[PDB]
Amino acid sequence: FINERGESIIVESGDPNALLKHRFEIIEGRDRTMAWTVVNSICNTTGAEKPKFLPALYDYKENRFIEIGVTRREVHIYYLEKANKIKSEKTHIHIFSFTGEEMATKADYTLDEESRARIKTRLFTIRQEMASRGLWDSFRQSERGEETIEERF
């Protein structure tokens, strides 16, 4: 939660205030229409360059987007595909693999390392549960066909 100036309180839970001033504005998981509407609105008000593809979140203090992905393949190939996909990228890119490997552009991880550790713990626990179940290999070998959609009428 940003405040009057460029800083955040980064509370743990249940600490609201009259000066909400949310530090992040989620873009992912809003529906394509609403996501693009908000992206165009913020780009117009700020006057930045609209990303060709839908980003994940947005930075208000710095006025740039952020892209976050989860990969089962090699991390470097996914990161470079993300970077080249984002033409004239003015938006930070962040990648979180299950094994814990992390990367970004310029290594400008503008986030609290405690959040990074929390997400790492969440991913590690998810990996533990998947390994106990046994679908982890299927997930690893099934990422290739997830992007493409085939009609099944």
Binding site: A18, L19, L20, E25, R30, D31, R32, T33, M34, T37, V38, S41, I42, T45, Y60
Partner: protein, 49 residues
């Protein structure tokens, strides 16, 4: 209009983003922002019932 989000959710999201951008640079002030945000919160509460 295209999209698959319920009408109330779309209306509330649009209202929230509009208020946010107005407050960031526009006419909307802190009092009106708080009032509209709390109204949207109670609208969401009524929806979720």
């Amino acid at each position: 209009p295209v999209g698959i989000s319920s009408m109330v959710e779309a209306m509330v999201s649009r209202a929230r983003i509009d208020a946010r951008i107005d407050f960031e640079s526009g006419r909307i002030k802190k009092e009106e922002f708080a009032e509209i945000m709390k109204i949207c919160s109670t609208i969401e509460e009524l929806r979720r019932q």
